[PDB]
Amino acid sequence: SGFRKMAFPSGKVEGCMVQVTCGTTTLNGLWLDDTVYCPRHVICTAEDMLNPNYEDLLIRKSNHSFLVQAGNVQLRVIGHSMQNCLLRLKVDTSNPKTPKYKFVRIQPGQTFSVLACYNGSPSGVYQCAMRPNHTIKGSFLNGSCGSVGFNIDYDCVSFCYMHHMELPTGVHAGTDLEGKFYGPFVDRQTAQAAGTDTTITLNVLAWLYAAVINGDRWFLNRFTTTLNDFNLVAMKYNYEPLTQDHVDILGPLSAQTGIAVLDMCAALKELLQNGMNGRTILGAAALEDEATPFDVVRQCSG
């Protein structure tokens, strides 16, 4: 078979995307039960962003100042409040399509699926990784704010991201579903910049294991390396250090291929020093680090 960075089926989530208009500002909201979540900067305007005070700005609003639409239909907001960077709007209608869900704060290195919306209307789904610097390399045009990232385990939607801002770098930033920012970032149009983006080492190995499982194994070697000697190389190449813990995770994949994680590290070390020299791995002129061990295992067995 093969390996493609896939996203979870977006159906369950499409049924929760609504639209939230406030003054001259429109974006996307997440409708679960009778609460509609969304970025709090929906109450701001252009020069508001220069330096918003959300306490002042919000005190000057009422339920009636938020127009929300589910499809063409109108929902009536009957309460508002602020949670960190999110607005929580109570509404009369509970959502019939509300799925078994929960809010989780994802960790850096971990991946999730993004459902890009515009005006409460889903545009497309793609998968991505929460970088070590806390940015996602996504695709978000204007109006995409309030779009959510998630994962589906069984029948249960774990929401983990809502979009807010685009950084000067052209890379993105947002919050968990409690309005807490991933990263140092704030919701102001100011000077903030992304930290340095290190390669997710553990993810690059998972993907190598994926390649081996798919016959692409030209990169292997007889050598091995101690955990230390490896990190000493990794760090030169802007790679995340490797812990005996990351190594443990890579267990089942080592067992499935009879390749020792420390042998695989040696493989990686050679690729890092000698370069990839034209050849391709799973069809890439470069090492993929947005696929996690869990991702690879659910896609690579018999």
Added chain:
Amino acid sequence: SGFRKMAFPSGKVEGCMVQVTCGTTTLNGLWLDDTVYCPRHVICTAEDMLNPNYEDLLIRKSNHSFLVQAGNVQLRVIGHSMQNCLLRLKVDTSNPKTPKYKFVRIQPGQTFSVLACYNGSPSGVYQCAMRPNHTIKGSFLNGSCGSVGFNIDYDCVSFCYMHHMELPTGVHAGTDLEGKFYGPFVDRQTAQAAGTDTTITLNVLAWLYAAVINGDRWFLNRFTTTLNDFNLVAMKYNYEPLTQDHVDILGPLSAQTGIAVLDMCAALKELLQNGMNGRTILGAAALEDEATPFDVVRQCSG
């Protein structure tokens, strides 16, 4: 903003995935109205594949020999037939979730979204391109047969692919939604092999235009080239020739960037001859050819 190869929201299609069991063989079926479509090899068994005769094999079956389930529920098949490589099973229940749809035969170079299923249950969505050799580089494990590829224009699902086989290469093959194979391929476990896989030239330019729109423009140059001189290079590098027609398509993108398609070709020619020399385009150590002009435009404006 950015650029990510996205897939269409899979919701409308998830509501059509059912399961089709026949003897010791289970796979996925596409339920629209009261017809359930699926690969005809559902009636085969192991050594049947060595050299099936679907006329014989099917004559020995009846409606009662096909168990189909929508979720946990059971549908009752009340008619069967064969269309090229597809089985069409009439059933009592029309599908409540049936969307505005249609069947289209996609052209090579064009892209579509795949919804990977197993046992009538959607596993994940990803986008991919129909290669010039008529294979898709997908991710399909055993049980994924009958999974569909599609595109959504407005509110209308255009189905264009159903999965059947995995080639020795580890690359895949299937049919349009009339059971006609894309490519020379047949549904027999035999020696068939994929032709040579040329790079979708038009798609590689669209993506360069995408990169320019995203500030990644280090690859441009003052030079230009005649359509001819370009193809003469392209062909050396296993690239699809370029027609004045492909060029016309690239119009709006040339107009949006003030970069002439023939100038962009010159850019590409240098990349093809001089190599990419370490640097990355839109974050790739290699040229992406599974994003079409249409794909790029819907994701790259203001």
